[PDB]
Amino acid sequence: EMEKEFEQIDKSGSWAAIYQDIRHEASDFPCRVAKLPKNKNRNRYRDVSPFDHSRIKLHQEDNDYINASLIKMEEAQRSYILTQGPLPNTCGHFWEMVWEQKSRGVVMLNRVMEKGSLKCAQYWPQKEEKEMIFEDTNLKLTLISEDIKSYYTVRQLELENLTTQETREILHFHYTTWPAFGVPESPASFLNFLFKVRESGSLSPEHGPVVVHASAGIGRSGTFCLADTCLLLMDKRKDPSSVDIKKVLLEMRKFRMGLIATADQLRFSYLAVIEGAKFIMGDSSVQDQWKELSHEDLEPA
């Protein structure tokens, strides 16, 4: 049934039209805090701001602003924090938020450098023996181990609140081949990654919301969260034909502007959910099929 709508949209060639429909219908809420002059150097992009009503507040008295938004999906029963790629001066804020919000996973969908341009600060440590200290926020971050696959890397990090000496294990899911304003290689590559995030428990209600970012935190991350929410909805109602993807995206856009940055990203989200539905509808084998088609394993020596 959702397939019918997709095929119909494909055959008619109106993805750009449906996408501009969404853009016109999208919530427009104020972003006053984000626009204050004292926050200018806390925003990566002038055209990407969190709404005042859903922004994450840092628990600090000096300045509580971080370019991050809480996407709370009541019906799906999941929350996500969508944020920009941290700036050199906001890496401390970023890990502060992770701590305060009790997040267990960070999903990164960009590379620090793309097309010879810096898109995100190196906010995590690359070598076990070179930990990072964020003094402004009294936090220490250490690389424990990493698992490098062909198009993504999972990293196990330890976050330490120096004040209380309490420590937490953060999982870092880094999608390394997803270009800005582009789409993943295949549905299998995207879904294999998504279900790796799910299998880690990072999305369990027993934790804070997962943090999802890219460079701006709306395009690739919007694609990621949209697909995950629709698949949750499909599992709860059990009826795939009930889930209206466009309605879900508009809901999400009440909490952060610009989610899904291209019509092709919108088209891909449909593809991903339709394919992912195979798992919802009870095909145990399909998860191994995604792993093969993703070619995640690297070549030995």
């Binding site: 990566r44 992009y45 002038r46 055209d47 990407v48 940055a261």
Partner: peptide, 6 residues
């Protein structure tokens, strides 16, 4: 240059 969508 300081805009996400150009």
């Amino acid at each position: 240059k300081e805009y996400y969508k150009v």
